[PDB]
Ligand binder design. Structure first.
Ligand SMILES: Nc1ncnc2c1ncn2[C@@H]1O[C@H](COP(=O)(O)OP(=O)(O)NP(=O)(O)O)[C@@H](O)[C@H]1O
Ligand SMILES: Nc1ncnc2c1ncn2[C@@H]1O[C@H](COP(=O)(O)OP(=O)(O)NP(=O)(O)O)[C@@H](O)[C@H]1O
Ligand SMILES: [Co+2]
Ligand SMILES: [Co+2]
Ligand SMILES: [Co+2]
Ligand SMILES: [Co+2]
Ligand SMILES: [Mg+2]
Ligand SMILES: [Mg+2]
Lengths: 588, 601
């Protein structure tokens, strides 16, 4: 029932030829200029990266062979002629370098320059170019490209091409030191001769480029890359400002984490938690490399549950896809994500100590993210890492006070290893749980979990600290029996039981067996319990025969009042008209 | 004030030299091997695509019998991945010029149909992502013609020799590097095929077993798809176990080529997943928004030939075409859902109940008014002019509006009975306008954001009641003056209430607009106040001096003054709750029980 035709039936017969791999130059240029980037606008990123690199090499040269000029990138638009022009005052290119570097695809002068530096040299970490293709991005948007270049050594040149397999080189006066590139834009790309549009692209990708960038004689990039600076030389106001820019936000960060490290990758990063809680009516952490935008929404570097963080991650040696808008599959990027997960958890844990009050607000607003993380990850070790961030209330603690799974594990009786919880809409329904009343008597402490999805979190948690979480789950004696028998008939299809109990000020209360049910209800088999010493109950007893119609309203009210006190009816609008009838008739 | 450096100053001196662009081949190979594809597994897709193309070329040549299939083999002991197709094969010139030359694609000069996948001339080199060594055995058809072995380590050179025992077609053997042993696992290779190549037009066999490849339903004639084929296909694309309640199979050629199928699940959406969905294809191979956020409940697939692919085959290439496509799809889906409401309103009611929250979200988070209104066409309400239970729409409301009218009135209450008997509705009934009844939690927020519809302002009943004070209060009471407090009694009572409720209310007023209710709370921007409470104000308390409870209060203030104050506090609380402006109701229960006992003697 198997069908395979793969068989070792081949044998080397005779002699063989040796060939070198070739490359169809014509088609390859078309591929860069058409089939490489998701957006045409990206040619501006590339040309500015080149200007930065040229400037960086000049700066490097002058450390040793010092000499004389300012280091700048200038952009000019001409909306009448349809041109885009960029000029840098960097190292420039002689005729040999124009032909070699521009004329040859995947040849990178910058890459060779990098490979020859001491790894410690500043330029080692700021040179952007790697592949030797970014320049061809100009043909995506231009029918004609002209390059004027003057090297810093001992004649100016003009390089020229339409990008169709050929190019021309001639001597030129009077070219300024560095390189000037003029793009004659295609008709469908004339938008890049608009100043406003070019400004949008520069700020998107290249806002943190190290050298001043001018557009039509005006400076743009006034924003310094805070993530590359020493964490201590940065003030709270700089973070507030930088946060707003990077998160496109208008509030401040409640938390700031400035993380720098060298392994598995170079990392310079800043993470923020917004002060404003998120909701339905609605950026992410951005990825950079050597100060250039890679992805506005970084995908592989953080786990999904940490998507509430804003900010930036920059790595010098993260493996980039050729398009420079994706990362390659890498064991190093996987390790980075794991490292960051642990760092952020560690940071939030520290914060729960420094200010439990503040952390309490944070957990109310963002705790859902932690719960999601515990449910969706498949690593038990990490589930218990994220679980250190959870807060609940406890049977063994007062109302409104939070504790962690660790603090519970702390207080446990020495001879036991079970974590008991009870997921309830509220505390009243918890304290009066049949299942919890059990754990009151013989057993001891139970976690009260009121938040949404607290349940399946713990179900998915399964195991914490090698331990197991498991859900713990007046009126005479015949005047009352008469009253009860009456009550069961007026509330036939509302409750599945009516009891009598020792309540004080409250004439009745609602209790529920399954908390699980009550959630379906709020999305039920209540048990009303009557205080036969309460005046309204004794009044109810008297009116059931004397004024049956009045006692019907009163009964309904006592039931509704009990459901409200149990948090089982949060919006009492349905009762108001009846209640008003009860009041008018009572007040005759 | 300006700093520029760019000046038209440069002039050419003497003649030019002419040059041809060149390529650094060795470094291109490295780029294809390490930097081109973001995921290693796609070498499987690329090799299958080549096999599929070779088979298409043979099919086209066989017109003008033999099997046409693709075989995969994993050897986890030898660390080897093998693929063999029964296609046209390659001759010596072909092995050299097409395989040996990066960016050379024989699958171009073949033209000359739309079944051919290969375009760039680089896909084959993806093998070097995962393999130290690659051997190729190919046999052309017919044509003369010898067999050949092609061989390379991936760096720089390769060798070809004539060979025997080469079956018609092409076999390729990947000697996997230690980094990539996962591709000698059958379960692993199977995962990849079904991910990218599950709609390939020829059978694929893995280690002798035929893979369950599928029909590209979206490309096919809609009328030839049975409900059951859609059920199955839905379950596949949505990875679900239930079936679709709606199926939209959309083809178009203008303005954009589009072949798509969308499904709405029969299941209600998980509330967990809502806070925490359509695949994109080209030529039957997977490609990795397209729908606006509010339509993320839809499942299914979109294919469009106007979307260009990047070199790596994982990104789309015109962020403006996409916005267009998305706008087209949004429009088509709204029209589809409007049509479903016509055909079967009862079934649509269930849909709206389960998914309505997505519409409301869409209305609230869009900035474009015409889009808010388009989505708003999907909303359903009840009406004061229709029997209980009968759903209607903004459009139908608009069509009943008299010539003079210029506003759409609405009232938000938990249910039909509460709206019909709302004090706000009693007040509105004195006018002759139709009032929409909206029962869902975020309906008010939604209409607040919607603001207007078809040039008609949306106004809540509660708001309209306040505005009428600043016009003519030309309304007469429901009860004759005999059944009301005299003015002197009304003024006396009000002055008392103002003292008893000093810092809780802005003012207190009688109103002729109530019947069943003793009082109501009014706030100009009621809706916005309700929304704000979900985490005081300048509320007005308006009393009905014809109501038994109000008149009794007038008496009580002079007979049991303490009881009168307790009554007063409760009336205010009742009006706040009825207004939807109440804080936690639990702490009022104490007062209420106390009030209840003192009343009952
Ligand atoms: N503005 C410039 N000034 C001086 N030299 C330049 C300039 N632009 C490009 N070059 C040179 O031309 C080469 C080719 O540029 P490019 O095609 O962008 O490849 P790359 O910058 O080297 N690497 P990549 O950007 O990752 O593809 C560079 O490496 C430099 O040697
Ligand atoms: N299995 C095969 N059988 C026959 N010819 C093949 C086979 N694989 C590759 N070829 C030939 O070799 C050429 C190069 O393949 P490839 O590098 O994948 O580029 P491409 O398929 O043409 N376009 P693309 O896949 O989009 O990069 C193809 O165009 C075919 O002419
Ligand atoms: Co052999
Ligand atoms: Co070195
Ligand atoms: Co000139
Ligand atoms: Co009309
Ligand atoms: Mg470059
Ligand atoms: Mg191919």
């Amino acid at each position: 029932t198997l069908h395979n035709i793969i068989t070792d039936t081949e044998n080397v017969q005779g002699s063989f030829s040796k060939h070198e791999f070739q490359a169809e130059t014509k088609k390859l240029l078309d591929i860069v200029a058409r089939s490489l980037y998701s957006e045409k606008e990206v040619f501006i990123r590339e040309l500015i990266s080149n200007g930065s690199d040229a400037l960086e090499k000049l700066r490097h040269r002058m450390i040793t062979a010092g000499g004389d000029a300012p280091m700048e990138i200038h952009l000019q638009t001409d909306s009448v002629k349809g041109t885009f022009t960029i000029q840098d005052t960097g190292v420039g290119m002689n005729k040999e370098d124009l032909v070699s570097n521009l004329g040859t695809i995947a040849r990178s002068g910058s890459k060779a320059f990098l490979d020859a530096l001491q790894n410690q040299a500043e330029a080692s970490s700021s040179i952007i170019g790697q592949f030797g293709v970014g320049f061809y991005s100009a043909f995506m948007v231009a029918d004609k490209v002209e390059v004027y270049s003057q090297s810093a050594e001992a004649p100016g040149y003009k390089w020229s091409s339409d990008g169709s397999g050929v190019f021309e080189v001639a001597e030129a006066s009077g070219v300024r030191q560095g390189t000037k590139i003029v793009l004659h834009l295609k008709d469908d790309c004339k938008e890049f001769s608009s100043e406003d549009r070019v400004k949008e692209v520069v700020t998107k990708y290249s806002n943190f480029v190290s050298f001043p960038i001018f557009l039509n004689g005006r400076r743009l990039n006034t924003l310094q890359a805070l993530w590359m600076m020493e964490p201590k030389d940065i003030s709270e106001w700089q973070h507030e400002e930088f946060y707003r820019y990077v998160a496109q936000a208008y509030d401040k960060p409640r938390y700031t984490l400035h993380y720098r490290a060298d392994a598995p990758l170079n990392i310079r990063s800043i993470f923020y938690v917004p002060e404003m809680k998120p909701s339905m009516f609605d950026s992410s952490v951005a990825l950079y490399s050597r100060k250039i935008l890679i992805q506005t929404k970084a995908t592989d570097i953080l786990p999904k549950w940490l998507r509430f963080l804003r900010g930036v991650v920059d790595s010098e040696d993260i493996p980039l896809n050729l398009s420079r808008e994706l990362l390659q599959e890498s064991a190093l990027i996987r390790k980075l994500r794991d490292v960051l997960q642990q760092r952020v958890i560690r940071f939030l844990l520290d914060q729960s100590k420094k200010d439990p009050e503040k952390y309490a607000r944070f957990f109310e607003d963002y705790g859902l993210f932690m719960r999601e993380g515990i449910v969706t990850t498949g690593e038990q070790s990490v589930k218990e890492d994220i679980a250190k961030l959870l807060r609940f209330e406890s049977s063994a603690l007062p109302a409104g006070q939070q504790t962690s799974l660790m603090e519970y594990s702390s207080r446990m009786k020495a001879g036991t290893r079970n974590i008991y919880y009870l997921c309830a809409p509220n505390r009243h329904l918890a304290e009066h749980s049949p299942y919890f009343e059990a754990m009151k008597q013989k057993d001891m402490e139970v976690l009260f979990c009121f938040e949404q999805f607290d349940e399946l979190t713990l179900l998915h948690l399964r195991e914490f600290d090698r331990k197991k979480l498991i859900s713990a789950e007046r009126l005479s004696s015949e005047q009352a029996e008469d009253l009860l028998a009456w009550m069961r008939n007026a509330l036939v299809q509302r409750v599945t039981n009516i009891k009598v109990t020792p309540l004080d000020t409250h004439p009745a209360m609602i209790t529920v067996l399954e908390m699980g049910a009550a959630r379906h209800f709020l999305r039920l088999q209540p048990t009303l319990e009557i205080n036969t010493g309460h005046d309204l109950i004794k009044k109810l007893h008297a009116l059931k025969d004397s004024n049956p119609e009045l006692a019907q309203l009163l009964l309904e009210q006592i039931y509704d009042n009990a459901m409200i006190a149990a948090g089982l009816n949060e919006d009492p609008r349905p009762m108001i008209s009846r209640l008003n009838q009860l009041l008018t008739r009572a007040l005759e």
